[PDB]
Design a protein around this ligand. Structure first.
Ligand SMILES: O[C@H]1[C@H](O)[C@@H](O)[C@H](O)[C@@H](O)[C@H]1O
Ligand SMILES: [Fe+3]
Ligand SMILES: [Fe+3]
Ligand SMILES: [O-]
Length: 258
């Protein structure tokens, strides 16, 4: 499945989980939201950004030791074959992990990729490596953040929660700034696709609004393709490019701000 008890990749993902749960604090996320929130680093098309990820392997992913750009196409393809009628959703597959361009810009990987969690409240039991990787996090020594709800009001809504910083929130905010013309569902899925304690573990319902609950099956449906299309046998990217460019032209055309 996705194996955190066995695997030939488990040490590197154990390091990045340990480093991520150590340094992802309320302060850190507040800093990074500003650092990236103006989308002033680069100008690029989707396929340019996709190609940039020809240069990136994920250290938090125990299912995968090849360029992450191949996984973009694999996820897109899996979705396209299961949901022929929803082209916007094919594209969400191609797009979802494009926020990882941040690791090519010198961000450490624990600050880019990986299962997300809410920062500013106590980590819940389904956070990977929760029992063993949070003891050097300064926020857990802070009474403002060490309780179940921490800085949050019950059922505030995930859109009102400060998530540990990485690819999902970067891309969510990117797509708003660039005004992608995808459905609300698309933005939501990308923004919370890493939030495994929530969509897979049964955790963080204290923070959920009814709207979040309603979105859960969409993110669970996205997640099964994100996860299970991961395979060493790679797509014919050159073959597929025209199809995806056609969707890019419809939903998020031209040079974009990153
Ligand atoms: O190792 C994976 C990879 O980093 C994904 O892009 C991320 O969304 C997943 O949550 C993580 O588990
Ligand atoms: Fe991801
Ligand atoms: Fe992914
Ligand atoms: O992902």
């Amino acid at each position: 499945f996705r194996n955190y008890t066995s695997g030939p990749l488990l040490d590197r993902v154990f390091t990045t989980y340990k480093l991520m749960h150590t340094h992802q604090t309320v302060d850190f996320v507040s800093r990074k939201r500003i650092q990236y929130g103006s989308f002033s680093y680069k100008k690029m098309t989707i396929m340019e950004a996709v190609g940039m990820l020809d240069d990136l392997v994920d250290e938090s992913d125990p299912d995968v030791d090849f360029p992450n750009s191949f996984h973009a196409f694999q996820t897109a393809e899996g979705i396209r074959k299961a949901h022929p009628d929803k082209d916007w959703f094919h594209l969400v597959g191609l797009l979802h992990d494009l926020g990882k361009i941040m690791a090519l810009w010198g961000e450490p990987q624990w600050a880019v990729v990986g299962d997300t969690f809410p920062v500013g409240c106590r980590p819940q039991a389904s956070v990977v490596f929760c029992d063993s990787t949070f003891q050097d996090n300064p926020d857990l020594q802070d009474p403002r953040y060490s309780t179940e709800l921490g800085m949050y009001q019950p059922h505030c809504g995930l859109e009102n929660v400060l998530m540990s910083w990485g690819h999902d929130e970067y891309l969510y905010q990117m797509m708003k700034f660039n005004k992608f013309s995808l459905p609300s569902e698309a933005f939501y899925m990308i923004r919370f696709h890493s939030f495994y304690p929530w969509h897979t573990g049964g955790d963080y319902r204290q923070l959920c609004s009814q709207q979040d609950l309603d979105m859960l099956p969409w993110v669970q449906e996205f997640n099964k393709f994100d996860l299970y299309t991961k395979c060493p046998d790679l797509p014919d990217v050159e073959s597929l490019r025209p199809y995806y460019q056609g969707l890019i032209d419809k939903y998020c055309p031209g040079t974009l701000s990153w």
